[PDB]
Every structure is written in structure tokens, then in C-alpha cells.
Amino acid sequence: LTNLVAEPFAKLEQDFGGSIGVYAMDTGSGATVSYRAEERFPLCSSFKGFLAAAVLARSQQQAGLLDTPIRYGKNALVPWSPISEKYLTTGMTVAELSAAAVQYSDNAAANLLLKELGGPAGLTAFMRSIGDTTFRLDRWELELNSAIPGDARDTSSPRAVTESLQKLTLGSALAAPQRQQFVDWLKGNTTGNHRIRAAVPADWAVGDKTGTCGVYGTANDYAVVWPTGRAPIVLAVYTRAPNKDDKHSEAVIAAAARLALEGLGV
Ligand SMILES: O=c1c2c3c(sc2ncn1Cc1nnn[nH]1)CCCC3
Ligand SMILES: O=c1c2c3c(sc2ncn1Cc1nnn[nH]1)CCCC3
Ligand SMILES: O=c1c2c3c(sc2ncn1Cc1nnn[nH]1)CCCC3
């Protein structure tokens, strides 16, 4: 069971004007903090984190898969491709595509990687193989960002995101090099300095993956944090709003992350 501080969480989303989903877990004591942990939230760009873990799982079936060169034209350059478009005239390897997708939310690199895993159904198939029965990816990049209310497409729950991130970063779902390569990619993410990272002390190691749909006030972040002298903490913070024109807030994601750490005891 949970040691929940629901009163500050409820007032936080009251000022935000939408819904906030949080699920945190102390991997040493099993204590959990859950607020709307079973509601569905649009994944947005946060699926790229599990997309890279899927490619890392296939690298165990295909040795040296991450060093495979992949060429592409402008037609594949989806808006916001700040890494893949610089290598348009030469291409990138699969490992570089995965690093760009996780660390820079590279949309072109994500579509190119999804085309190699069997599409959104292929990535969803990998999540079922690790035990995730809530995750579902339906559309390709930028289309998956519609975040329509009541739409189960391209959604998951903060609890299922947290439990899946735990099994991929600290569990047996990946081999030791594949697991360490996943943690390294999340640690080097550059998009989450104003979210979960803003609520974590600087002397703590953290690896995160963000996601911003833009519309319906839908932004999110999940991370596994490494406090000093304690067992690691895995958490997910997901937000959405009832109106299309509603804006998201990175400070609300940081504040919810701060409340989850306090509710746990760090
Ligand atoms: O090029 C960058 C970069 C780069 C970064 S961050 C960034 N942000 C925007 N942009 C511009 C952009 N292009 N397409 N969407 N945004 C680091 C490596 C060098 C290129
Ligand atoms: O934003 C940029 C950019 C941009 C460039 S280059 C560059 N380099 C780093 N960065 C920031 C950075 N990302 N990772 N390390 N540093 C051209 C278009 C505008 C944005
Ligand atoms: O994805 C974008 C985008 C996009 C833009 S701007 C932008 N800036 C940062 N990022 C990086 C990011 N956002 N949330 N997590 N990481 C327009 C088309 C859709 C994608």
C-alpha cells in the first residue's frame, strides 16, 4: 500500500487546471506514492525511451545491430530533428539514432527506428513481452501527439510506465551491457533539466526521458534517480488538460516530482 500525500497533489493539479498522474517507487523498501496512477495519459515523446530499450533488446538477438548504418532523405526529416538532419547527407548508425531519440527527442530518428522494429505494433509487442499490458503505441511520430481526451491511442499509465522502466533499468528485462547502455542514454538526456531533474539534488545521478505533446496541456517525464546511500527511486509524472488550447507547465512536473520524493521520504 501507499503512504500518500494526496492533499498537496490535489491542490497542485487544481492550480494547473488539468490532471496529474504520478507513480513513484522506492526500490529498497517497496514504498509507493500513487496519484491517478492507473489513468491513461498520452505518452508523447516519452515512448522514445522504451523505443531504445526495444532496440537494445533486439541487439541481444542481433549482435552488432547498434553499429548498422542507416541512410535517409529529407522526406524522413520530421519537424524537430536536431540531430538526424545534421547527418542527412551521410546517415547515422542505429546506436546514434537511439541516442538522438532518447537524449534529444529526435522525431526523425524515432520514426526511422520504429520502421525497423515492426512499427508501433512492434514496439507494443516488445512491451507485452516484458510484462507491460497497459502500454500501447498506435501511430507514428507527431501523429501520436494528438492527445485527444478519452483516446486510448498512444497512451499508458504512470504506474505501468514506472514498473516497465524499473524492469528495463534495474531488472532482468535486459542483459548487463544492454541495461547499462540504457541507463547511460537516459543519464545523458538534454530535454529534462526543468522537470524531474529540477526536483532532484545535484549530487544524485538521474536518467530521464521527457515527452511534450504540445496540445491539451500534455507534458510528462519519467526517471530513475540514484540518491546517495539509498536504493534507487523510479518515478513517472504525466500531465494532461481538458482543453486543446491549454498549455503545459514544466514547473508543475517538477513540483509533482518534488511531492513524490517527499511522500516517499527523500
Ligand atoms: O540544430 C539544433 C540543435 C542541435 C543541438 S540542440 C538543438 N536544438 C535545436 N536545433 C535546431 C533544430 N533543427 N531542427 N529542429 N530544431 C545539439 C547538437 C547540434 C544541433
Ligand atoms: O541548442 C543548441 C544548438 C543550436 C544550433 S547548434 C547547437 N548546439 C548546441 N545546442 C545546445 C546543446 N544541445 N546539446 N548540447 N548543447 C543551431 C540552431 C539553434 C540551436
Ligand atoms: O520535441 C521537441 C519539439 C517539437 C517541436 S519543438 C520542440 N522542441 C523540443 N522538443 C524536445 C522535447 N519536447 N518534449 N520532450 N522533448 C515541434 C514539433 C513536435 C516536436
UniProtKB/Swiss-Prot annotation:
Q: Does the keyword Signal apply?
A: yes
Q: Name one Pfam family in it.
A: Beta-lactamase2
Q: List the EC numbers from the record.
A: 3.5.2.6
- Could you list the residue ranges forming a coiled coil in this record? none
Which consequence is recorded for altering residue 154 to N?
Reduces thermal stability of protein
Show the catalytic activity: a beta-lactam + H2O = a substituted beta-amino acid
According to its UniProt entry, the function of this protein is described as: Class A beta-lactamase which confers resistance to the beta-lactam antibiotics, including penicillins, cephalosporins and carbapenems. Acts via hydrolysis of the beta-lactam ring. Has penicillin-, cephalosporin- and carbapenem-hydrolyzing activities.
**The name this protein goes by in its record:** Carbapenem-hydrolyzing beta-lactamase KPC-2
According to its UniProt entry, this protein's organism is Klebsiella pneumoniae
